[PDB]
Design a protein around this ligand. Structure first.
Ligand SMILES: CCCCCCCCCCCCCCCCCC(=O)OC[C@H](COP(=O)(O)OCCN)OC(=O)CCCCCCCCCCCCCCCCC
Ligand SMILES: CCCCCCCCCCCCCCCCCC(=O)OC[C@H](COP(=O)(O)OCCN)OC(=O)CCCCCCCCCCCCCCCCC
Ligand SMILES: *[C@@H]1O[C@H](CO)[C@@H](O[C@@H]2O[C@H](CO)[C@@H](O[C@@H]3O[C@H](CO)[C@@H](O)[C@H](O)[C@H]3NC(C)=O)[C@H](O)[C@H]2NC(C)=O)[C@H](O)[C@H]1NC(C)=O
Ligand SMILES: CCCCCCCCCC(=O)OC[C@H](COP(=O)([O-])OC[C@H](N)C(=O)O)OC(=O)CCCCCCCCC
Ligand SMILES: CC(C)CCC[C@@H](C)[C@H]1CC[C@H]2[C@@H]3CC=C4C[C@@H](OC(=O)CCC(=O)O)CC[C@]4(C)[C@H]3CC[C@]12C
Ligand SMILES: CC(C)CCC[C@@H](C)[C@H]1CC[C@H]2[C@@H]3CC=C4C[C@@H](OC(=O)CCC(=O)O)CC[C@]4(C)[C@H]3CC[C@]12C
Ligand SMILES: *[C@@H]1O[C@H](CO)[C@@H](O[C@@H]2O[C@H](CO)[C@@H](O)[C@H](O)[C@H]2NC(C)=O)[C@H](O)[C@H]1NC(C)=O
Ligand SMILES: CC(C)CCC[C@@H](C)[C@H]1CC[C@H]2[C@@H]3CC=C4C[C@@H](O)CC[C@]4(C)[C@H]3CC[C@]12C
Ligand SMILES: CC(C)CCC[C@@H](C)[C@H]1CC[C@H]2[C@@H]3CC=C4C[C@@H](O)CC[C@]4(C)[C@H]3CC[C@]12C
Ligand SMILES: CC(C)CCC[C@@H](C)[C@H]1CC[C@H]2[C@@H]3CC=C4C[C@@H](O)CC[C@]4(C)[C@H]3CC[C@]12C
Ligand SMILES: CC(C)CCC[C@@H](C)[C@H]1CC[C@H]2[C@@H]3CC=C4C[C@@H](O)CC[C@]4(C)[C@H]3CC[C@]12C
Ligand SMILES: *[C@@H]1O[C@H](CO)[C@@H](O)[C@H](O)[C@H]1NC(C)=O
Ligand SMILES: [Ca+2]
Ligand SMILES: [Ca+2]
Lengths: 465, 241, 283, 144, 9, 144
């Protein structure tokens, strides 16, 4: 809470400089060689790391470290400005660490890609870094609300070749940005729509349903003549099925195609006339088709338009839609600022099993005076603090109990926060094929022998009794 | 001539070059004697049939004087200037040409080649004028538009800094972004003339066509299929020249 | 009107876009239904000409071309049995009906072809040279390009740019962690090789066109050393590309010289010279 | 182009003027030749569209020298006629219908195209050059 | 919802 | 002789040039092509008549090969880049200037007109030198 308040105020007080002298922003960059013996506006810090058995790594309490992924340049005017204004977060980092000496990490994900964590430690050691703070599960949890996503893949003849491979990879990467609270189904349509996999209505994005969808997408072949009015009339109908369980909010449609001629006004006027379903249109591949109807489709219905001409753009274009989804919660005001705890997952910096509390940081530039609200509808980032499962285990002593006795905790989804059977290993998703990022989610019924009484007990604990 | 073909370019201190140096001394001495005797007979004071009236004599003088000057410079301290002795060594290649005058039939072929040059001179002037016009037009159309980036996703120069991920088959490699110019461009009249000569010879002109049809604007990265109408320029060039 | 119909049909053919698999643009579906009108107009023209001329229709080659185009089109259109698209390929010849319409283009083609006839004897020489060099290459370079630097532990290509290798000093030795194992696909995905007499002929022709022949020289140098491959490749170029060009130039120059002194050309030149004298005197 | 008037003060004006006059006299016979060449290019482009067409959508991307659209077909046929990198286009065309296994019969298209194009271009342009230059020379000699 | 993207590209 | 060498076995392989004598039976077929034989014989006789015209070209090749040897002879070929940039690194172990025969081969390849511009770009200034040259800086290659 206090970190978010300070970050909001510091952003409110910032001035958008453009001319940066060679030494105006000072930071560590958390990825530089400690012994270079040697930039456009930045001056590096040579810090001192001694040791800390609480982390196992070598850390510095004097300042925070900044991680900037490989793709994003660190000399851009959009990155230098944040590297300047986020420098005020170090004082609050130190204050929190001195008030509670048991704090492990205090990360501030940013909408541009950089992450600032207080204990200055070098990043994880072809060793190329594909880490992006805007795709981690805690950031995704804290940047939007549970979704009802229905990916609509174009499988006509024209998407054959490179376009099909790019579409498959993009769909897989989009599926990777989904939590257990999110429900997703993947459909396809050349001339008549059909479900890509055995699922027919909607499935929650577990680690297994996602693999099923990914395999079914990778089995897709392209043949036929595009018919938008039969694919959208199918997507909107599977978004109306209420016999099954769903997140029941943020009903969004993903259209993966190349380009066309039909805008299908009748289908939208028939199904979505009050505009309760968002539409995101993707123009995948390198071609010269008419990218006109899909932009209008993403404009008339709430949504945004993306272009994926290569493998590099896949990650950013698939991750960007959270920025669009985040507008209602920031417009809600100081009511969406609720701390949410993620599922148990292996820490990126190798602390083992942890859970992160997430608080969104809103844009309050010109809040006092009602002048500017156009760009205030996008989040600045997500704050995050990590608590290790070792702390929760220490809060529950077991040596007064018999060895057969133990403690366990259940979240609403039914996964175990604490359990003796739970181990720091990724969940097995299937038989290993011949020739850490995923959350560790183990159900209560999958950690012990399933019994009739243990299901009723699980339901009662989920209800909160 | 045979000795010039046996030197080792790679290793200056090779055992064969040391031996060939003395052959060079002997040949230079023989040529000095031949030149000095020809000077004695022909003379220097405006005899109107003297040495320096016929071009071949000037060529022989250049060869021998270059040899002697090269021997002179290495007289003391060779490390001061090595390019100087290198160029004078390169000057030795004119020895094969010293047989055109000495073989009457070879001179009768060289004169035929010269007449062939003389007959087509005016058409050559017209050809150069037309190619100059085409080069100027190409400069106007494609001036500064032949800039690209190592990362294709970045259009401008300011964006092409840092590192980008090169997604190769089965391996992902991190490389640097560079704002490079194309190998054959149209920046001034000389570059345009060179590029048009390369196109006329037929080598690599499809790449030039692709670069021309992908040219968007000055100081901006290419966009595929932007201006496909530029193919008419290269069609007309091929039809004409 | 027949010429206008031919031009319109050419435009329609030039306004068609092809998409992979079975995809079709909306405009293509509209364009496809205009074929009945064109084939009906052509059928009407053929019918009226044959009934009025009382077939000498097939005597003229242009009328034969129009007639065969008409029959191919009407057979392709009527009856979708076996889904014949090979009879859709005949439509490319319809642009050539413009020459049939315009006699001047017929005269110009006659002028081109008459001069082009002497080159058949040069083509026979080219074919014989290609055959001899293909036989020699097949006898010497048989199956030598199916051995690359395979991985040590597994039968996988070491890199993404395979090249021929050998198992001795004269050839190209593989790196320390690789070995030469048989049956690599070959250069240019196996299209360029000396395996049959057909691959040999195609390869020799490609070398004759002075395209990619240094790639073959380098591949053969890697496969079996560089000592003797030049004696096969450089004389191939010299005999089949420069000598043949010289023969073609000589024959064409002789044909043009003989053509100039014909009676019609002489009369035209005399007319031009007299007109130029008149213009000088007028000036 | 007005700098070509400087040739008047030299003795080379007669031959150049006669060449220009001969070129302008047989200007219909040059337009007809160019039109027939264009017609043959169009026919071969249409044939290439029918045979290969949209089948050049390989997994690594559609090559720039494709037969998808009519302008692209014309460009590709022109490049084959000039003889530059025609073997690469032949390789792509063979690869489109299978490969070396069951697509080697499509090399006839490229063989015929290049073989006819080289010698037809040579004939069509050398005939023009020789005829006009000979006429210019004869006019110059006769006027002198 | 005026930032739809097409206009800004 | 080829058959006896084959049936002998082992020994020395005696290469395969004897099989060129096997393949050379096609030349006997020229005794029936009266027009073809006359054409070939006339052009060969004309080529033999002019020995010095074919010597001027040899002299040109010799001079340019020597100039290339003395100017671009020490360019290093051992370096291969991560991508190898085939377009610009055209000076390799097959297309170098290191000896007279390799220089002549490069000149002939350029005369045939096959990526000569890439070789010209590769021979420019600023390229790494060879290890045995004696120069420890990237100062090999000229703007010439
Ligand atoms: C219309 C008119 C048509 C006229 C047609 C005229 C055609 C002439 C074309 C040239 C003919 C010779 C072609 C030579 C190709 C050699 C290819 C080769 O691989 O040679 C190397 C090879 C040794 O490699 P290895 O792997 O051990 O054995 C391979 C056998 N499968 O094999 C060897 O050991 C070498 C085999 C001998 C090759 C050359 C024999 C000499 C032929 C000409 C001699 C000229 C005088 C000498 C000049 C050069 C002196 C170095
Ligand atoms: C002669 C004056 C100019 C003539 C030009 C007139 C017409 C132009 C035609 C172009 C001439 C092409 C001749 C090509 C010669 C050889 C080409 C070649 O690839 O040679 C490779 C081979 C090995 O070359 P090299 O590096 O010297 O040997 C290793 C030594 N460490 O080389 C050899 O081992 C070949 C040995 C003899 C070369 C043939 C003579
Ligand atoms: C974004 O970058 C700016 C450049 O570093 C920072 O703005 C500068 O902060 C300096 C703090 O040291 C100021 O220096 C002092 O300011 C006082 C006024 O209070 C003046 O007496 C002096 O200029 C100076 N003296 C002291 C006490 O050191 C700079 O005036 C100020 N201005 C500039 C150069 O832009 C911001 O700090 C930074 N933003 C954030 C949020 O950190
Ligand atoms: C100043 C006057 C210059 C006149 C030059 C000769 C002009 C007449 C020759 C001619 O028109 O024939 C053209 C013929 C077509 O061959 P091509 O189209 O297959 O060329 C392929 C191309 N070069 C490549 O490899 O990429 O073959 C050629 O391309 C000609 C071969 C090169 C020129 C002649 C040999 C010189 C090199 C030994
Ligand atoms: C075609 C006409 C102009 C005559 C041919 C001239 C060249 C092609 C010949 C003539 C003498 C030859 C040279 C004679 C001897 C040698 C030494 C020979 O031995 C070596 O390997 C180098 C010596 C060493 O290792 O010390 C290598 C080839 C070479 C340079 C020869 C290369 C080719 C040369 C220059
Ligand atoms: C022997 C000579 C007389 C024949 C040469 C053929 C020309 C008449 C052809 C060959 C290439 C053609 C061009 C290829 C490409 C284009 C772009 C295209 O125009 C567009 O803007 C299309 C947009 C796109 O394709 O993306 C169609 C016209 C044009 C100039 C074409 C016009 C006709 C051209 C010049
Ligand atoms: C399940 O959903 C389907 C459509 O998603 C609906 O089907 C109805 O089923 C009931 C009885 O099974 C029948 O009245 C009709 O077949 C359907 N109702 C309609 C369309 O009038 C229905 O919402 C759900 N089915 C059930 C079991 O109630
Ligand atoms: C100059 C005249 C004779 C022309 C003939 C040159 C040839 C045939 C002769 C002249 C000088 C000779 C070289 C002289 C010295 C050496 C060093 C020795 O360790 C290897 C042979 C080698 C490299 C000789 C090779 C052959 C050679 C190059
Ligand atoms: C014969 C002499 C006069 C040569 C002059 C004619 C040349 C320079 C002219 C004739 C036709 C011209 C082209 C005609 C149309 C276009 C399309 C335009 O959007 C860009 C320029 C471009 C591509 C022109 C470039 C210059 C051009 C090729
Ligand atoms: C000043 C210029 C002409 C230098 C000479 C360059 C030579 C190598 C160039 C220029 C003229 C060119 C040829 C002229 C004629 C033809 C025939 C035609 O079918 C294709 C183009 C083609 C193949 C050209 C390619 C190679 C060529 C001979
Ligand atoms: C007949 C020839 C020699 C006359 C033409 C001269 C021009 C075109 C050429 C020939 C010699 C060349 C020079 C030779 C050597 C060098 C050294 C190099 O590091 C920079 C360029 C420079 C200085 C060249 C510039 C261009 C140059 C002056
Ligand atoms: C390469 O060969 C040399 C031979 O001595 C050896 O030292 C080196 O270890 C080899 N590399 C491998 C992979 O064995
Ligand atoms: Ca489609
Ligand atoms: Ca080529």
């Amino acid at each position: 809470v206090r970190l978010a308040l300070e970050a909001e105020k510091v952003q409110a007080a910032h001035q958008w400089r453009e001319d940066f002298a060679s030494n105006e922003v000072v930071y560590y960059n958390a990825k530089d060689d400690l012994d270079p013996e040697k930039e456009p506006g930045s001056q590096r810090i040579k810090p001192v790391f001694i040791e800390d058995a609480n982390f196992g790594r070598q850390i510095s309490y004097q300042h925070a470290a900044v991680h900037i992924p490989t793709d994003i340049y660190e000399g851009s005017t959009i990155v230098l400005n944040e590297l300047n204004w986020t420098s005020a977060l170090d004082e609050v980092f130190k204050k929190n660490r001195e008030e509670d000496p048991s704090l492990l990490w205090q990360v501030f994900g940013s909408a541009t890609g950089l992450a600032r964590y207080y204990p200055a430690s070098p990043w994880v050691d072809n060793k190329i870094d594909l880490y992006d703070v805007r795709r981690r599960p805690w950031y995704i949890q804290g940047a939007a609300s549970p979704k009802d996503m229905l990916i609509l893949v174009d499988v006509s003849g024209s998407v054959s070749g490179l376009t099909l491979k790019l579409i498959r990879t993009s769909v897989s990467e989009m599926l990777e940005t989904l939590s257990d609270d999110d429900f997703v189904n993947v459909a396809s349509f050349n001339s008549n729509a059909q479900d890509v996999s055995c699922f027919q209505h909607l499935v929650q994005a577990n680690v297994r349903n996602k693999k099923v969808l990914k395999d079914a997408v990778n089995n897709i072949t392209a043949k036929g003549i595009t018919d938008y009015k039969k694919g959208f009339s199918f997507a909107f109908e599977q978004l109306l099925n209420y016999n099954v369980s769903r997140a029941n909010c943020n009903k969004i449609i993903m259209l993966f195609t190349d380009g066309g001629e039909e805008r299908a006004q009748e289908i939208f006027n028939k199904y979505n006339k009050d505009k309760k379903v968002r539409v995101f249109t993707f123009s995948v591949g390198q071609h010269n088709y008419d990218r006109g109807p899909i932009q209008w489709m993403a404009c008339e219905n709430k949504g945004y338009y993306y272009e994926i001409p290569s493998i590099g753009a896949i990650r950013i274009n698939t991750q960007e839609y959270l920025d669009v989804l985040g507008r209602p919660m920031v417009l809600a005001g100081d009511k969406a600022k609720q701390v949410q705890w993620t599922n148990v997952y292996l820490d990126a910096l190798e602390l083992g099993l942890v859970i992160t509390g997430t608080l969104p940081v809103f844009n309050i530039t010109g809040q006092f005076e009602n002048k500017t609200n156009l760009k205030n509808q996008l989040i600045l980032g997500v704050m995050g603090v990590d608590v290790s499962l070792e702390d929760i285990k220490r809060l529950t002593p077991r040596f007064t109990l018999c060895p057969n006795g133990y403690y366990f905790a259940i979240d609403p989804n039914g996964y175990v926060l604490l359990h003796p059977n739970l181990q720091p290993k990724p969940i097995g998703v299937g038989i290993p094929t011949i020739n850490s990022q995923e959350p560790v989610t183990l159900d209560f019924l999958d950690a012990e022998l399933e019994n009739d009484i243990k299901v009723e007990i699980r339901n009662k604990m989920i209800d909160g009794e | 001539s045979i000795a010039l073909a046996a030197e080792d370019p790679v290793q200056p201190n090779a055992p064969r070059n040391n031996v060939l140096r003395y052959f060079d001394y002997v040949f230079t001495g023989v040529f000095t004697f031949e030149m000095v005797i020809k000077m004695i007979d022909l003379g220097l004071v405006l005899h109107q049939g003297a040495y320096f009236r016929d071009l071949w004599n000037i060529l022989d003088f250049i060869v021998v004087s270059g040899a002697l000057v090269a021997f002179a410079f290495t007289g003391n301290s060779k490390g001061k200037d090595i390019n100087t002795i290198k160029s004078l060594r390169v000057l030795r290649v004119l020895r094969p040409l010293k047989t055109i005058k000495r073989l009457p039939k070879l001179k009768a072929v060289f004169d035929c080649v010269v007449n062939s040059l003389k007959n087509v001179f005016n058409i050559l002037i017209v050809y150069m004028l037309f190619m100059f016009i085409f080069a100027v037009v190409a400069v106007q159309l494609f001036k500064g538009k032949f800039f690209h980036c190592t990362d294709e996703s970045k259009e401008f120069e300011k964006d092409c800094r840092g590192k980008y991920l090169l997604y190769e088959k089965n391996e992902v490699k991190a490389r640097d972004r560079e704002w490079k110019k194309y190998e054959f461009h149209y920046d001034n009249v000389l570059w345009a003339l060179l590029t048009l000569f390369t196109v006329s010879t037929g080598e690599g002109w499809p790449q030039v066509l692709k670069h021309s049809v992908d040219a968007t604007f000055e100081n901006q990265g290419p966009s595929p299929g932007y201006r496909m109408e530029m193919s008419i320029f290269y069609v007309v060039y091929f039809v004409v020249f | 009107m027949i010429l206008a119909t031919i031009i319109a049909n050419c435009i329609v053919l030039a306004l068609e876009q092809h998409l992979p698999d079975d995809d079709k643009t909306p405009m293509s579906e509209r364009l496809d239904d205009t074929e009945p009108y064109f084939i009906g107009i052509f059928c009407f023209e053929a019918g009226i000409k044959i009934i009025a001329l009382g077939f000498s229709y097939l005597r003229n080659g242009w009328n034969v071309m129009d007639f065969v185009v008409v029959l191919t089109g009407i057979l392709a259109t009527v009856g979708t049995e076996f889904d014949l698209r090979t009879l859709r390929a005949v439509r490319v010849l319809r642009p050539l009906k413009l020459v049939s319409g315009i006699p001047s283009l017929q005269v110009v083609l006659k002028s081109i072809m008459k001069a082009m006839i002497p080159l058949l004897q040069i083509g026979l020489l080219l074919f014989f040279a290609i055959l001899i060099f293909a036989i020699i290459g097949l006898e010497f370079y048989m199956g030598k390009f199916h051995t690359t630097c395979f991985e040590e532990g597994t039968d996988d290509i070491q890199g993404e740019s395979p090249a021929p290798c050998g198992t001795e000093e004269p050839a190209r030795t593989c790196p320390n962690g690789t070995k030469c194992q048989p049956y690599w696909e070959g250069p240019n995905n196996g299209i360029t090789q000396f395996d049959n007499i057909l691959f040999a002929v195609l390869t020799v022709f490609q070398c004759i066109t002075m395209e990619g022949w240094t790639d073959l020289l380098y591949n053969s140098n890697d496969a079996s050393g560089n000592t003797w491959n030049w004696l096969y490749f450089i004389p191939l170029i010299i005999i089949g590309s420069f000598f043949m060009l010289n023969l073609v130039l000589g024959v064409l120059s002789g044909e043009f010289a003989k053509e100039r002194e014909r009676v019609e050309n002489r009369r035209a030149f005399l007319k031009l010279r007299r007109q130029q004298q008149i213009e000088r005197e007028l000036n | 182009l007005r700098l070509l008037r400087i040739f008047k003060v030299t003795k080379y004006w007669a031959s150049l003027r006669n060449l220009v006059v001969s070129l302008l006299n047989s200007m219909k016979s040059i337009i007809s030749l160019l039109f027939l060449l264009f017609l043959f290019i169009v026919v071969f482009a249409l044939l290439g569209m029918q045979l290969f067409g949209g089948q050049f959508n390989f997994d690594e991307g559609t090559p720039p020298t494709n037969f998808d659209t009519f302008p692209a077909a014309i460009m590709t046929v022109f490049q084959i006629l000039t003889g530059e990198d025609w073997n690469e286009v032949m390789y792509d065309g063979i690869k489109s219908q299978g490969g070396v296994q069951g697509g080697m019969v499509f090399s006839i298209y490229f063989i015929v195209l290049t073989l006819f194009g080289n010698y037809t271009l040579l004939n069509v342009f050398l005939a023009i050059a020789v005829d006009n230059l000979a006429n210019a020379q004869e006019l110059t000699k006769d006027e002198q | 919802y005026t930032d739809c993207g097409g206009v800004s590209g | 002789t080829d058959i006896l060498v084959t049936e002998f076995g082992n020994n020395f392989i005696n290469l395969s040039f004897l099989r060129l004598f096997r393949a050379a039976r096609l030349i006997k077929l020229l005794r029936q092509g009266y027009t073809i034989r006359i054409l070939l014989w006339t052009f060969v006789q004309s080529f033999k008549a002019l020995p010095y015209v074919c010597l001027l070209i040899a002299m040109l090749f010799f001079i340019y090969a020597i100039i290339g040897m003395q100017v671009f002879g020490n360019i290093g070929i051992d370096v291969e880049d991560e991508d190898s940039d085939e377009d610009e690194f055209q000076i390799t172990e097959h297309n170098n200037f290191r000896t007279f025969f390799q220089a002549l081969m490069l000149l002939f390849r350029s005369a045939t007109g096959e990526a000569w511009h890439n070789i010209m770009l590769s021979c420019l200034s600023g390229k790494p030198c060879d290890k045995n040259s004696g120069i420890l800086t990237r100062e090999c290659g000229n703007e010439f």
